[PDB]
Design a protein around this ligand. Structure first.
Ligand SMILES: [Cl-]
Ligand SMILES: [Cl-]
Lengths: 226, 226
């Protein structure tokens, strides 16, 4: 059975995780884990309560690891236990993946050094200090690393992983079973397509978070430099 | 505060719910409820454990009600307590909505009689016996009813509801904040675009479920005929 694991942490953006979870859980001969320091309740940034299924120490060797993003990424970038777990699993995983600001956690763990990667548009400047080659594309692959932008990045890249772990017909069948054919009613999902006034509002609302994450990123980079 | 409620039931397809939940929970001055017979754990069809936040009796009057789909829809179509709750809330709600097979629950409650509606492609033949005018479109509006197809239907229609409850700029800001710009790597999300061999596989895998739901639908229709 293919072993797939998601890191589940306080203040996660839950859709970053629950999207790919439902897609990948639809495949035959997979087992999906929700990993934290101990099994039990973990609260997402919206207040939704989720349950972790396994601890770091009890998690099996993973074939796929996925790091979601969210407010809670800042704490995780300086959590030595979580970073060590990610490094251990990444060493043998077939696919190391992240959604949105989850790539900043991979960066803090040292897994983006010399690698092409993306992250959420408002935090993209934090990739270079973590050693990455920043790329402004929605899905960026470098070897076995796959970083994706947008809250539903993991739904799309889960179909790619299905095709590569199984075959294209299996990925197509899952897409059809889920009737997955998005059609957003607005075209404002990128700073290059949204109205300038909307981009300003969004940047202003992210400014305090970006400031705090600049500080965290520099401390994380100092640890990598040692 | 706008009151938004999702029905959370055993064997729900969790993404049908968790997608619109994270979008709508991002708006100012909303309160989101996860409703079942009592607060506490409810297990989705994938095994993911979610928590209901309120009972039927304690739920406030809702401005928006959303019925997700999933395996568990069959039981809900013959649950008199759940159907009565849906009818009570629909009477005063500004928006009555569903995702995927959630529209079959609205049908069992009598809320599709004479109304245009859609549902998941494999179960579309069950709409007419519930009194609906079946429509093969991804999002179908009829008055204050909004039925949508696909596991992520509620992400897209949540942006529509944001624009109508607030304004277009608010919907665009949320889309940008979430960097929501899907791009599926395959084009098999409709029986009209998927390869014929894939459609056959998917129809065969749904056949036992469709048979059981034909029986349930006829009993539900008999109750409406009384
Ligand atoms: Cl997206
Ligand atoms: Cl969809």
């Amino acid at each position: 059975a293919v072993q797939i694991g998601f890191l589940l942490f306080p203040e996660v953006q839950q859709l970053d995780l629950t999207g790919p979870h439902d897609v990948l859980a639809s495949l035959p001969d997979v087992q999906v884990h929700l990993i934290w320091k101990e099994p039990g309740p973990v609260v997402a940034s919206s207040g939704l309560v989720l349950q972790a299924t396994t601890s770091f120490a009890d998690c099996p060797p993973l074939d796929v690891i996925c790091i979601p993003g969210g407010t809670g990424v800042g704490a995780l970038m300086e959590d030595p236990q979580a970073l060590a777990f990610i490094r251990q699993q990444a060493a043998r995983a077939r696919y190391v993946t992240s959604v949105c600001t989850g790539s900043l956690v991979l960066g803090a763990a040292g897994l983006l050094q010399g690698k092409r990667a993306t992250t959420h548009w408002a935090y993209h400047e934090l990739l270079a200090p973590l050693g990455a080659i920043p790329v402004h594309e929605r899905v960026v692959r470098d070897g076995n690393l796959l970083t994706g932008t947008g809250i539903t990045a993991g739904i799309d890249f889960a179909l790619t992983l299905a095709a590569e772990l199984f075959d294209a017909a299996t990925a197509q069948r899952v897409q059809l079973q889920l009737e997955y054919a998005p059609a957003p009613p607005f075209n404002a999902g990128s700073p290059d397509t949204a109205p300038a006034s909307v981009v300003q509002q969004a940047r202003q609302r992210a400014a305090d978070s970006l400031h705090k994450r600049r500080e965290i990123t520099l401390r994380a980079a100092a640890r990598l430099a040692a």
